[PDB]
């Protein structure tokens, strides 16, 4: 599976991006759905962002987990909820109000997927 | 009153009853955890029985299960036969009943578009119950 | 032969087996009641398994359950919803109650498809109500009502 | 995987869990038998869950059940389930075995696999009936 | 039910045909599907037989169990497996190699079936 | 059609095997379904047989009629009933109790069936 | 597969029963459907038989090939046709008229089938 | 009750009514035979109408038809129906018996009962053909 | 006519056309055999196209294929198709024969005719395999 | 992108390829005719592949086939086995492939209401190919 | 909803990326489909890019991600609304025309998770 | 057993047979390539015929076709559409190309119904592309491009 | 279509990011599915990443190809496999073990897609 | 002449007819806007009626609706209001609901035939614009229910 | 967003828009009546649009329609008449038929989803009232066809 975590530059975290990724990967492995080595995550800081139209300082944190298709809705929902809890806990604050944390779970087409080990 | 709703509600009722039995075979800490779980199941039955009109479990409840799963994963080195002790056998039974309830809830989710969080909870519950069963066997032997 | 018949008979069989286990945890009067129930279930299985060719439970058996239900309602005055299994004994009865409900679901399928077993279904519904009451009575007697949070 | 497969595997899992509970109420000989059965059930779940890719139980495992059935038939001559607490547990396991059998039969009808597993579960339910009666007969 | 057991003349058995038929009937009864008196079995020795085309000495043992339809595949398979175990155990040897043992279970049409006791 | 009649060696008949085969063929012809020359019947005496498990002396009589598919259930049932009546009447007695008489009617696949006259 | 060949005692053959079984097995193998060692055939002489009702001397030859289900109708028909050709060629004569030669192909239930090598 | 059941019972009722008309045109021996057949048809309607709860005709009743068929086959060697007024009535009954047979076959296919009754009706139609030909042959 | 009939007849027509091409690459003995086969295919198209009204190939024609198969089996002991140009043509015809077989099987399943023709085509495909291997073996 | 369209287009492609092979076994006049036919098939594939959006063959092209059919009918006295010569065998093959293409196009016509002219062309083509095959055998023997 | 706007480094915009993001959010709000606070957009400059195989080329691509449940009219309108904003924001870039494109995709609502800290 | 499986396997068989014929009309390098392709098809037939139980072609086999496709694209710079079969040799390859496409259609049916054979399908698509190129290269070499009118 | 290639910063490539994109575009064009100018690819270096939970140093390379819907599974699979071959061959090393290379092919909704040339 | 096509075409025809009635109750500016919309609907009917053979409205036409939506949005700042505060605005409220009815018919065509997505987007935006135009008329006359 | 729900909601929206147009041609008394009806329709759209999650109109609202029906009934004593004796009454005849069209859409929702029965009853009574109001206007102006 592939996880992308996106954070606005004005978002303050309790831990480093490195540590957050480690916590995210541990949470994904706890699902029991994935081999350890197959969990690949990355963190991106957003420098050019806008939330809404209001002139209020806002920070947000978003994740997108991509997994190969075939897993049921319970698994997908659990994966999303597990990641959202981890991300929410890592938030220290940012902007002038609350921080929106969201997680999408999407499915990659298994039949056409290609993987190699070099 | 739809059959899939009735079946899902009934099987959740069966789950909390078997948990109600198992909690008399565990220590006080584990009993506390199982009774929190019984409360969560009551909330889930409220939502499913009302076809989503009444609110179900919060995501904080799933996070709570996840916390416990991460905790007990450390004292378990993950194949062994179910029921190493009488006590752990009770939890193995509950785990399989949780999975049965999950199958019924999944049917509801696919037909009515509700109970996705409930299903995630039940899947997480079944994994925790597996771990609790193994932990009991370890703390005994 | 018919899957709904086989499933209903199988689930009834599972119900009387769980009642068979529970009756070793209750007192003599309740044991006597649970054993009468096992006999009623055996009668029900014979009718369902034969698709209504062999007679099932009489209306008097349902009247009997109703008598017990009225008797034990006098003893149970719950203010709230309670968590199942306040004691080990009551937990076994709660398990039996839910299996009775599962049996009821299977028998209902048979009734709607074959037009037989309505009285059996009525019996199972009343049984599940009685089992709820017996569970609570035991918890009252030992002061082990755990109210839902 | 497929719903019938999931349901069959799950119900088999429930069966071995109930057997795992029951084996703490029987003597050492019956305990040994029940644990072999748990190993057989695990083998069956492998075959069913993999839709036949992985091999299931052999004919010899069924032959082993038949030998035990013939043995305990010698000791056993319409009774209510659960004459004793111990026999009640085996009566429960028996009915769960039949419930698993119904689930596996659906897989066999749909996917054409698990016939041997179905036969095993049928024979198992017969053995469990016999074991429950033997316990009661010894305890009068 | 009706059971036919066919054995090539060069097959050696650990017991007599009679004892084998008794074991088969006990195994069939142990299924719980039939009344004792309804199990009818017979043993046939094949005097004119050929297995394959190669100039190899071979022996085989085959059984055909015929039952009235209505039973499910689990029962039909259990009956065949039970009989096959009984037959395989009865084999001492034969020919210059392993002995093929096989059992078929077939169903008789119940609706057209005729039975009487004189 | 092909008719096989199997009788245990301890079965006593009111007529010879030959006469019994003649009666069976006349009954089959009287159905009106077959050409006279197409009715082929044979009688087999079972020398190695066991009925049940109990130490009781028993005799049985079984017939299997094989016809090409295509006929309806009424015809298949009439054929079995006709044969069963002929067989039951032929029974004088056997063993220490009543004699079980049974008749199966089975269908041969017509599409793959091969027939020639030399 | 299992092949049974039944011949009335008054049937004259151009070869021995043994040679006939060899020819049948070679024909069955030539279909390409079976392993050599799996083809099991037997020959039976019918001593008590009646064909029809008329006082005419007749002889017949019948074969029944039993195979595990799964093959299509083309294969089942080819097997029957192959065997029928072998049997018809083997017939020298019999009775006072032409000899009816017939072959059935039947299917054994694969799912319940039991097989072992001792 | 169910439509196929109703149709089968009704057509059987029509059959015995037409036989009841025909028996006034035949001699005393054939009259005795036709009245036995009416009793058999009444037995069949009981079984069919009750969807198998009540027992139908025995194998012996079919055996009785076979005996009569074999008897009259001895006397009978492509002819137009109704060579005489008497034989015409039996030809009518024959075709009604086949119509009842088709109705009962539907019940057998749907409900799995009445196979023996279907066999009886088939044999009956054959007997009625023979009886019609015997009458004509005697009257040249 | 019906679509499955049209498709079966057309594919049979394609088969005999490809055989008609192949027979110009083989020797005189094999050429004689292929032309008999073309006559048999024409007979089959008559039966199939007329939905069974006109008679198709006899059992003897299948018996003729079996005799040739047994003959060339004696000479032939996993190889890539088309070891030589000649054998490549027969390998093509073989696969076309199987394609015709699939089309005829549909007709047999739907209309209950052409079973003998299907058997013939199956045996033909086997013979064509053998003929292709015999050519290669002679040419090393 | 519908399956019947793809199947019809693919089988037309197979037809023009086999004609592409056959044209190396005929004389210059016949080669000219076969190459005109290959062009017609390309036009037909354009129309079918576009679900009728692009125009197909004109009726003049059917008339052209009909002219050739009337012409060659005179030198053929219409039953003989396919492939009298190697050359004519090639045309017999093309004829049966033309009929296969016709079956696929017919399916398109009945489902989408297009390709009727294309189907008429293919039927006419198959008859011409039969005649050309017989003419070759005659002009050789 | 989440909007990602990708621009090749050689693309010249009429305004700053920030201004472009504001226009995009305003257009999205004008659809009437979303709460103002829910609309989240980000801008990315592609520093390593190739278009085709041959030439100086610039392009501009957006991907709008919304929770599922809305019909095709709404999805098409959202895409067309953003495409107009993006197209009007292009001042030039490269030695040819600038390709502007917008994808609208759907996030699975049932499995979606969100919380406010 | 399954008709789509049988049809796909049968059509693959037909493809390698036509390739078997064509390889006697091309030069040694192309013959070597066509024989490698026959082996790949044999591997594909084993997987499809077993419904994905026996392993099929590796991704490296598809990479191999792509390498050849890139190599021969350098040699083919068509300005227009061309008529199939400019030479006898190229005509055989055009026939093979269309049979490969027909095989692809059958395998696609298997993929959509059974969820197996996607890599095989990808291989057949690339194969048909390669066969097109080889046909044109031969026609280039002999100057026999016949442009569509 | 749009191609995104992501490489962990510790991944060693055989060429520059720019040349890798050119090779990827050529492979995509060789599919014959796209006009040359429509193929748009971008390369991203990941600076903050984690693979799995173990302490072992790992590098990975991932691509996501987005195309308008409408093409069959054979085409989608061939595109993925083609890109995977190009990516794998471009890997020189990185980390302390094998490098996982993976390619996803996803479909953009054609009906709602908006495109303009300015 | 497929039923969903005929119904979609018919309802678009009904929409442009009601707009044609409405434009006689609005000021000259809105009348000009409504006539442009009538021309766009004519173009849409050509595309749908031809099952996509004829080109339909462009993205530019949708962008034009959006520009007007943004323009009139800064004049409207509503709670929910009852339709038809004035006779004039009631005519536009009617057109808005007819546009939604047309949108429903077009959606069936898009889902079944894969054409008309842009047209559907246009009709959705149109209904939004007509809402705004209606409120603008009411606000100007001080007649918001 | 189920199609029958969307269609029922859309048609109710069309109804209240036409009523909004009609109320500018009637006297003040009927205008007040029509505006109450617009508010009831708004309430009905909330219930249907939410698949019954939000409470719909009460029995009291139906009883209010009935009271008005009984009131205007004693003024009307018709043979059958052609719709639209006057311009004003024609507007109400239009609303009546739109109400019936809305009723048909709501009936589909009730039969398929088990909600909206009261709403359907309301729309049926409404169509009856609108009939009466139309004839009252015509009788007063002496314009019964
Ligand atoms: N998309």
Secondary structure (H, E, C), O35-102: HHHHHHHHHHHHHHHCCCCCCCCCHHHHHHHHHHHHHHHCCCCCCCCCCCCCHHHHHHHHHHHHHHHH
Q: Would you say G52 and G27 are in contact if contact means Cβ atoms under 8 Å apart?
A: no
- Write the residue in M52, M83, M99 that is nearest to A118 by C-beta: M99
Tokens of H102: 């088709």
Residues of J annotated in the binding site, as ranges?
127
Tell me, yes or no, if J26 comes closer than 8 A to chain I by beta carbon: no
SS3 category, M72: coil
**Nearest residue on chain K to B106, alpha-carbon basis:** K110
Residues β-bridged to residue F117: G100
Residues 6+ apart with CB under 8 A from J107: J4, J7, J8
Tokens of E18: 């009679």
Matching CATH number, H1-140, of 3.50.50.60, 1.20.1200.10, 3.10.20.30, 1.10.3720.10 = 1.20.1200.10
K26 touches ligand 1 (CB under 6 Å): no
- What residues of M are in the L interface, CB distance below 8 Å? 26-27, 30, 32, 72-75, 77-78, 81-82, 84-85
> J14–L102: do the CB atoms touch at under 8 Å?
yes
Tell me, yes or no, if A28 comes closer than 8 A to chain K by beta carbon: no
K96 touches ligand 1 (CB under 6 Å): no
Query: In angstroms, what CA-CA distances link I117 with C33, I99, N88, N119?
Result: 72, 13, 81, 57
Tokens of M11: 């991944």
SS3 category, A2: strand
Q: Would you say M6 and M62 are in contact if contact means Cβ atoms under 8 Å apart?
A: yes
DSSP state of A19: H
Is L94 labelled a binding residue?
no
Q: For residue D119, which residues of chain E lie inside 8 Å, CB to CB?
A: 74-75, 77-78, 81
Helix J116-140 crosses helix J28-49 at what angle (to 10 degrees)?
Answer: 160
Q: How many of the other CB atoms lie within 10 Å of CB of J80?
A: 9
Matching CATH number, O1-145, of 2.40.110.10, 3.40.640.10, 2.40.30.130, 1.20.1200.10 = 1.20.1200.10
Backbone gaps in chain M, preceding residues (C–N over 2.5 A): none
Residues of J annotated in the binding site for Mg(2+), as ranges?
127
Q: How far apart are CA C59 and CA A23, in angstroms?
A: 63
Q: How far apart are CA O107 and CA O12, in angstroms?
A: 12
Query: In angstroms, what CA-CA distances link A14 with A28, A94, B3, B62, B67?
Result: 20, 11, 48, 22, 18
Dihedral sign from CA coordinates of H23, H27, H33, H35:
positive
Instruction: Single out the residue of J105, O136, G84, O25 nearest to residue N86, CA to CA.
Output: O25
Tell me, yes or no, if A110 comes closer than 8 A to chain M by beta carbon: no
DSSP state of F98: P
* DSSP secondary structure string for all residues of E27-54: HHHTTT-S-GGG-EEEEEEESSEEESSS
Q: For residue J79, which residues of chain I lie inside 8 Å, CB to CB?
A: 42
M108 touches ligand 1 (CB under 6 Å): yes
Instruction: Single out the residue of I108, I120, I121 nearest to residue I4, CA to CA.
Output: I108
Q: Would you say G60 and G101 are in contact if contact means Cβ atoms under 8 Å apart?
A: yes
Substitution target in A6, A30, A112 with the highest count of M β-carbons within 10 Å is: A112
Q: Would you say G101 and G61 are in contact if contact means Cβ atoms under 8 Å apart?
A: yes
Tell me, yes or no, if D109 comes closer than 8 A to chain C by beta carbon: no
Residues of O annotated in the binding site, as ranges?
128
Query: What is the pairing mode between strands E100-108 and G114-117?
Result: antiparallel
Cβ burial, residue N142 (10 Å; 0-12/13-18/19+): exposed
Tokens of N103: 């949108």
Please list the alpha-helical segments (H only) found in F12-102. 17-29, 73-90
> Under CATH, what is the fold of the domain C1-149?
Hypothetical Protein Ta1238; Chain: A; (1.20.1200)
DSSP state of E71: B
Report the Cα–Cα distance between both ends of chain M, in Å, rounded: 18
Torsion region of A99: left, alpha or beta (phi above 0 gives left; psi -120 to 50 gives alpha): beta
- Write the residue in F27, F30, F77 that is nearest to H119 by C-beta: F77
DSSP state of K116: E
Length of chain N: 145
Q: How far apart are CA G93 and CA G112, in angstroms?
A: 41
Task: State the DSSP H helix or E strand holding residue H13, giving kind and residue range, or none if neither.
Answer: helix H3-22
Q: How many of the other CB atoms lie within 10 Å of CB of E92?
A: 11
What are the φ/ψ torsions at residue K85 (nearest 5 degrees)?
-65, -50
CA dihedral in degrees (L129, L135, L136, L141; nearest 10)?
A: 140
Q: Which residues of L43-73 are buried (b: 16+ CB within 10 A; e: fewer)?
A: bbbebbeeeeeeebbebebbbbbbebbeebb
Q: Would you say L44 and L12 are in contact if contact means Cβ atoms under 8 Å apart?
A: yes
Tokens of H116: 């023996």
SS3 category, E93: strand
CATH code for the domain in which residue A32 is found: 3.30.429.10
SS3 category, I36: helix
Angle among Cα F2, F7, F13 to the nearest 5 degrees reads: 110
Tokens of H6: 């109703």
Q: How far apart are CA D132 and CA D92, in angstroms?
A: 10
Distance K5 CA to ligand 1 centre (A): 15
Please indicate the experimental technique that yielded this structure. X-ray
Q: Which chains touch G (3 or more CB pairs under 8 A)?
A: D, E, F, I
Query: In angstroms, what CA-CA distances link G82 with F112, G104, J42, O30?
Result: 11, 12, 48, 95
> M50–A26: do the CB atoms touch at under 8 Å?
no
SS3 category, F33: coil
User: What is chain L's alpha carbon radius of gyration, rounded to the nearest angstrom?
Assistant: 16
Range of the domain at G5: 1-118
Task: State the DSSP H helix or E strand holding residue M107, giving kind and residue range, or none if neither.
Answer: strand M100-108
Distance from CA of N41 to the nearest CA of O (A): 20
Query: In angstroms, what CA-CA distances link B29 with B62, B140, C91, D84, K91?
Result: 19, 16, 19, 33, 67
The label of the residue with tokens 């039966």 reads: I47
Task: State the DSSP H helix or E strand holding residue N134, giving kind and residue range, or none if neither.
Answer: helix N117-141
SS3 category, J24: coil
Q: Taking the mean position of all CA atoms in its chain, how far away is CA O41?
A: 8
**Nearest residue on chain J to L95, alpha-carbon basis:** J17
Cβ burial, residue G22 (10 Å; 0-12/13-18/19+): middle
Residues β-bridged to residue D81: none
Tokens of F35: 């050409």
Q: How far apart are CA M13 and CA M7, in angstroms?
A: 9
Substitution target in D115, D118, D119, D122 with the highest count of G β-carbons within 10 Å is: D115
In the β-sheet with G40-46, what is the strand arrangement from edge to edge? E49-51, G40-46, G2-8, G60-68, G100-108, F114-117
What are the φ/ψ torsions at residue F2 (nearest 5 degrees)?
-120, 125
Dihedral sign from CA coordinates of J42, J45, J51, J52:
positive
The label of the residue with tokens 């190396």 reads: J24
Q: How far apart are CA B109 and CA B121, in angstroms?
A: 13
Tell me, yes or no, if B112 comes closer than 8 A to chain C by beta carbon: no
Distance A104 CA to ligand 1 centre (A): 15
- Write the residue in N62, N73, N128 that is nearest to K80 by C-beta: N62
Instruction: Single out the residue of H70, H67, H93, H88 nearest to residue H135, CA to CA.
Output: H88
> D18–B95: do the CB atoms touch at under 8 Å?
no
The label of the residue with tokens 């800290």 reads: K117
Q: Which residues of O98-121 are buried (b: 16+ CB within 10 A; e: fewer)?
A: bbebbbebbbebbeeeebbebbbb
Tell me, yes or no, if E108 comes closer than 8 A to chain F by beta carbon: yes
Substitution target in F24, F33, F42 with the highest count of G β-carbons within 10 Å is: F42
**Nearest residue on chain K to A60, alpha-carbon basis:** K40
Tell me, yes or no, if O38 comes closer than 8 A to chain N by beta carbon: yes
Q: Which residues of M21-31 are buried (b: 16+ CB within 10 A; e: fewer)?
A: bbbbbbbbbbb
Tokens of H139: 């009257």
CATH code at J1-141: 1.20.1200.10
DSSP state of F71: B
Distance K102 CA to ligand 1 centre (A): 9
Residues β-bridged to residue F4: F42, F64
The label of the residue with tokens 């595949």 reads: E73
The label of the residue with tokens 């029991």 reads: A32
3-state secondary structure chain G: CEEEEEEECCEEECCCHHHHHHHHHHHHHCCCCCCHHHCEEEEEEECCEEECCCCCCCCEEEEEEEEEECECHHHHHHHHHHHHHHHHHHEEEECCCCCEEEEEEEEECCCCCEEEEC
Query: In angstroms, what CA-CA distances link J88 with B97, J12, J82?
Result: 74, 21, 8
CA dihedral in degrees (H121, H127, H129, H131; nearest 10)?
A: -140
- Write the residue in H62, H105, H109 that is nearest to F81 by C-beta: H62
- What residues of A are in the L interface, CB distance below 8 Å? 111-112, 114, 116
Distance B122 CA to ligand 1 centre (A): 32
Angle among Cα D126, D131, D137 to the nearest 5 degrees reads: 125
Q: Taking the mean position of all CA atoms in its chain, how far away is CA M25?
A: 10
Q: How many of the other CB atoms lie within 10 Å of CB of F55?
A: 5
- Write the residue in D60, D70, D105 that is nearest to E74 by C-beta: D105
Distance from CA of K1 to the nearest CA of A (A): 10
Q: How many of the other CB atoms lie within 10 Å of CB of A7?
A: 26
Residues β-bridged to residue E49: G42
Q: How far apart are CA H46 and CA H56, in angstroms?
A: 7
User: What is chain D's alpha carbon radius of gyration, rounded to the nearest angstrom?
Assistant: 15
> G100–F109: do the CB atoms touch at under 8 Å?
no
Q: For residue F113, which residues of chain I lie inside 8 Å, CB to CB?
A: none
Residues 6+ apart with CB under 8 A from M84: A114, A115, A116, L59, M63, M101, M102, M103
K105 touches ligand 1 (CB under 6 Å): yes
The label of the residue with tokens 């025809």 reads: N13
The label of the residue with tokens 């897609």 reads: M113
Tokens of C141: 């007697």
Q: For residue I82, which residues of chain L lie inside 8 Å, CB to CB?
A: 17, 19-21, 23-24
Q: How far apart are CA B57 and CA B44, in angstroms?
A: 6
Query: What is the pairing mode between strands A11-13 and G11-13?
Result: unpaired
Q: How many of the other CB atoms lie within 10 Å of CB of C3?
A: 13
Helix L28-49 crosses helix L3-22 at what angle (to 10 degrees)?
Answer: 170
> K116–A106: do the CB atoms touch at under 8 Å?
no
Residues 6+ apart with CB under 8 A from I131: I26, I30, I33, I72, I90
Q: What is the resolution of this structure in A?
A: 2.1
Task: State the DSSP H helix or E strand holding residue B35, giving kind and residue range, or none if neither.
Answer: helix B28-49
What are the φ/ψ torsions at residue K35 (nearest 5 degrees)?
-75, 140
Q: Which residues of B63-87 are buried (b: 16+ CB within 10 A; e: fewer)?
A: bbbbebbbebbeeeeeeebbbbbeb
Q: Which chains touch J (3 or more CB pairs under 8 A)?
A: I, L
Tokens of F77: 């049932």
Q: Taking the mean position of all CA atoms in its chain, how far away is CA N59?
A: 16
Q: Would you say K96 and K55 are in contact if contact means Cβ atoms under 8 Å apart?
A: yes
DSSP state of M62: E
> K115–B113: do the CB atoms touch at under 8 Å?
no
How many structural domains compose chain F? 1
The label of the residue with tokens 């010894």 reads: D138
Q: Which residues of E45-84 are buried (b: 16+ CB within 10 A; e: fewer)?
A: ebebbbbbeeeeebbbbbbbbbbbeebbbbbbbbbbbbbb
Domain ranges of chain N: 1-145
Distance from CA of C7 to the nearest CA of D (A): 8
Please list the alpha-helical segments (H only) found in L3-117. 3-22, 28-49, 59-73, 88-114
């Amino acid at each position: 599976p592939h996880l992308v975590i996106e954070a606005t530059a004005n978002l303050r975290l309790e831990t480093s991006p490195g540590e957050l990724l480690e916590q995210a990967n541990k949470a994904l492995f706890a699902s029991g759905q994935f081999g350890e080595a197959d969990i690949k995550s990355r963190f991106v800081t957003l420098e050019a962002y806008r939330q809404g139209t209001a002139a209020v300082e806002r920070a947000y944190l978003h994740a997108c987990l991509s997994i190969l298709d075939g897993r049921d809705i319970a698994t997908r929902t659990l994966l999303g909820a597990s990641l959202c809890a981890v991300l929410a806990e890592a938030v220290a604050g940012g902007g002038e109000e609350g921080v929106q944390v969201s997680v999408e779970v999407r499915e990659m087409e298994r039949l056409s997927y290609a993987k190699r080990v070099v | 009153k739809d059959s899939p709703i009735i079946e899902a509600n009934g099987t959740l009722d069966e789950l909390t009853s078997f948990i109600g039995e198992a909690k008399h075979y565990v220590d006080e800490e584990m009993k506390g955890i199982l009774e929190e779980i019984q409360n969560d199941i009551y909330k889930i039955m409220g939502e499913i029985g009302s076809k989503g009109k009444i609110e179900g479990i919060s995501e904080e409840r799933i996070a709570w299960l996840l916390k416990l799963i991460l905790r007990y994963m450390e004292m378990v080195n993950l194949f062994v036969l179910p029921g190493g002790t009488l006590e752990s056998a009770k939890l193995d039974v509950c785990r399989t009943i949780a999975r049965r309830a999950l199958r019924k809830v999944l049917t509801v989710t696919r037909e009515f578009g509700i109970g996705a969080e409930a299903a995630a909870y039940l899947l997480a519950l079944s994994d925790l119950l597996f771990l609790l069963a193994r932990v009991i066997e370890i703390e005994k032997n």
